[PDB]
């Protein structure tokens, strides 16, 4: 039951906790790169357009 | 309707049975979101037996994973229809034309 106190605590558990992303044809070492997460209220995953 | 079209979109909606097309043409006796009944009105079946036709226009059933297939009446009651024009419309079709 997403009780809105959990959300604030989720912000604390991801604060300086990186999350590595990865695309399908992993050709070179840059095909996996870690990021810091920013919680977004959508079901899509958002990406920096430079990487 | 697709504003910029090709002209083919009529024969695509009607060839696939997704739309309910008139079997023989008369004047619409009764419409409903549930079914459509039509008085054939001219040279019906060889014996003089029960001129009217009845079309049932399936509604709100699931498709193959997972879209929604239903039909709607596109004709108002008391309107003369000839054989072979859209009586009911299905998913992604607009009175004869295909509209994805």
């Amino acid at each position: 039951r997403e009780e809105a106190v959990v959300w604030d605590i989720l912000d604390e558990v991801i604060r300086e906790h990186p999350v590595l992303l990865n695309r399908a044809p992993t050709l070179h070492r840059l095909g996996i790169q870690a990021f810091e997460p920013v919680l977004i209220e959508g079901k899509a995953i958002q990406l920096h357009p430079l990487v | 309707k697709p504003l910029v079209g090709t002209g083919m979109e009529r024969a695509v909606a009607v060839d696939s049975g997704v739309t309910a097309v008139a079997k023989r043409g008369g004047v619409v006796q009764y419409v409903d979101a549930s079914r459509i009944v039509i008085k054939v009105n001219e040279d019906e079946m060889y014996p003089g037996e029960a001129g009217i036709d009845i079309y049932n226009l399936t509604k709100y059933t699931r498709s193959n994973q997972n879209t929604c297939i239903n039909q709607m009446p596109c004709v108002s009651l008391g309107e003369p229809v000839e054989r072979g024009d859209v009586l009911a419309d299905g998913p992604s079709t607009d009175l004869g034309e295909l509209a994805l």
Partner: protein, 234 residues
């Protein structure tokens, strides 16, 4: 109690030309180079979003359990009726929630006039199409609920506000609150006797009828005064 400094030219409201019950042309003559371009876009954004409005939010229909069924003798299925109720042009006099009942039988369309009228509720378009009864014995009865809100507040937003909304016959319908569709503004340098550098901000506006241009501009402008209020001090 001093001082400090000041300058000229506050704006004022002039001829408000009504072209119809929906289209209107407000004009503000005493304006700068200047604020005719500063206020035009800063008024449009507040008018187009943050205005109060009334739209249908819940519709209970008798003999109708879920919004995907039909009803005998009705040309349109239930979802189509629910989408004709999103476009109800209702102006409520002094409440935030009015339960409008609608009963009508017999072959023929069921327009907005066929509602059980109310003294508090003016209907801006009585010619609105809601139904099409096709059987002589077709009869429909529903308890529409109009509410007062702002910001489109769709049905999925308000399941957390259930609080035991158990009634299964109650169809929840999306709000489309704000009564402003288009907002244009022109600069059109103004013909003031002196001070040759003065423009008149000409706001064209097309609404749904449920709000008059006068209070529409004033509620919108007042929001800015309240918003800018926290800017003076810090």
């Amino acid at each position: 109690m001093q001082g400090s400094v000041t300058e000229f030219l506050k704006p004022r409201l002039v001829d408000i030309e009504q072209v119809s019950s929906t289209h209107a042309k407000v004009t503000l003559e005493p304006l700068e180079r200047g604020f005719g371009h500063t206020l035009g876009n800063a008024l449009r954004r507040i008018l187009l979003s943050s205005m109060p409005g009334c739209a249908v939010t819940e519709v209970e229909i008798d003999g109708v359990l879920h919004e995907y069924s039909t009803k005998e003798g009705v040309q349109e299925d239930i979802l189509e009726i629910l989408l004709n109720l999103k476009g109800l042009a209702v102006r409520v006099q002094g409440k935030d929630e009015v339960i409008l009942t609608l009963n009508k039988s017999g072959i023929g369309p069921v327009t907005a006039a066929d509602i059980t009228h109310d003294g508090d509720v003016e209907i801006v378009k009585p010619q609105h199409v809601i139904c099409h009864l096709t059987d002589e014995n077709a009869s429909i009865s529903m308890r529409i609920k109009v509410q007062r809100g702002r910001g489109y507040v769709p049905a999925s937003t308000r399941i957390h506000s259930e609080e035991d909304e158990r009634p299964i016959g109650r169809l929840l319908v999306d709000a489309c609150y704000s009564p402003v569709e288009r907002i244009a503004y022109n600069v059109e340098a103004a013909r003031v006797e002196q001070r040759t550098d003065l423009d008149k901000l000409v706001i064209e506006m097309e609404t749904n009828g449920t709000i008059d241009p006068e209070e529409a501009i004033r509620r919108a402008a007042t929001i800015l005064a309240e918003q800018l209020e926290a800017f003076v001090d810090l």
